[PDB]
Amino acid sequence: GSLTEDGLSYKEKFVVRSYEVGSNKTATVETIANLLQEVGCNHAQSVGFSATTTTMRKLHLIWVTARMHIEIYKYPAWGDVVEIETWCQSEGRIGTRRDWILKDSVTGEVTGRATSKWVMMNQDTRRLQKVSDDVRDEYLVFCPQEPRLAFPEENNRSLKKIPKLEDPAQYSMIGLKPRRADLDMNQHVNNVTYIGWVLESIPQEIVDTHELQVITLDYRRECQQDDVVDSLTTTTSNDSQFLHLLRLSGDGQEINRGTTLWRKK
């Protein structure tokens, strides 16, 4: 892992592991989403962070994931080397964006790409707020000035509105709880666990005959360690599409909503 020549992006190589692959001997979307988080942490570490800035630590402010969009063309096989390139960008007072390009090391061909929107939140009160000017200057020196998009297209599927799943759901996975492996160093549930929870409602037949091409996720609430979750799914559609919804088992408080696109293997 190292920053590029300009110092405005970061590149890292990963060798895919035996326990990281699914039934097709290729990496899982959660392994990819874990690898994207790792290269993002190493990019923040390489530029002097611990991605809280000096003003964010002083004000008890943190960056939380508002949205995650991943598109995979080829899943790296067990033993393959996957090069991931990541970079950050400001989106005015709304928040920040982090993009990724996944490539095969051998061929140099783009095998995937991801984009994520992050919102500013007070760590203690959980109150979202706009980005102040003092914080925007602290990270503008590590971001490209001109716009660099992983999903540039005028009608890209990364900025699409997601509706709320109506009851009854076609498919469901009830009683999902996080374990200590699902928590980060600060004891909050890892963002990758919600993705794995969304896909639990998808039937095994769809997984055994299709491959996940696109996954968009909107994060609305934080799941505590002692919380219980319900994954809900309804087909909205060669290609199969789904509407997803994660909610607490009790009250049904919405924690997540998203869409998945699957293609025939």
Place this chain on the structure above:
Amino acid sequence: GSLTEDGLSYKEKFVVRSYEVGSNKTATVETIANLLQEVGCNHAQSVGFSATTTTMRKLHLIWVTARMHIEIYKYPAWGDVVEIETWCQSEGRIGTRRDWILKDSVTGEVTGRATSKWVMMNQDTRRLQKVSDDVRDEYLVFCPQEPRLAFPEENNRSLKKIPKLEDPAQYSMIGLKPRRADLDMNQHVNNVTYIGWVLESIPQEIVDTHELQVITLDYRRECQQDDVVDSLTTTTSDSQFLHLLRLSGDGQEINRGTTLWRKK
């Protein structure tokens, strides 16, 4: 990753990741148990395996974990490089053994060690075999001839009998189910998930004040993807615990073990 000079052991270096560490900024025992499995897979791959031998493929025979014993002295911190060395050994017609030595790359100091016993089983049915002579010759060319033990000590912790937890348990974690991330490429539940399930019954106070030094696990049954598990724990004492994993319904035993925790 590469085999040593003699070709009878395998060494690999791992850089610890952000998502692999716990609340103490050091690797978790499950991350270590995952890393041990990875270096074992790479050791088997480096010597021509798909650790199934040629006569094992034709007979529909696989190696299953009967026991796992891990002892950690220092958990590698986030960003640290951990060198793991692994090797296999035959234990006559009883089965095979795989050992590991964990070291810090910078200092070269031993930060942990592990040992595991594996039994031969028919993949189709669940009948444990006693290892034939045709299989012994196929893997004796990749094993040291003289005994090389990670836990050599006469009458040590790794070969201790484990009793069955009596009801009522002091602590419990009920309704544990595996997700698709908890399964391997063959759709069976990863053996690391049972370790994570054993530790779910341990109270958060013990985790926040102690560090897991030793973990011994005896595997009795496989957990299917559609099965529901119950983790049970009782303090037997440094703090020691007696653990038991069983199916939610009938209470069929799937696992039993013991843990040792030192004050941070």
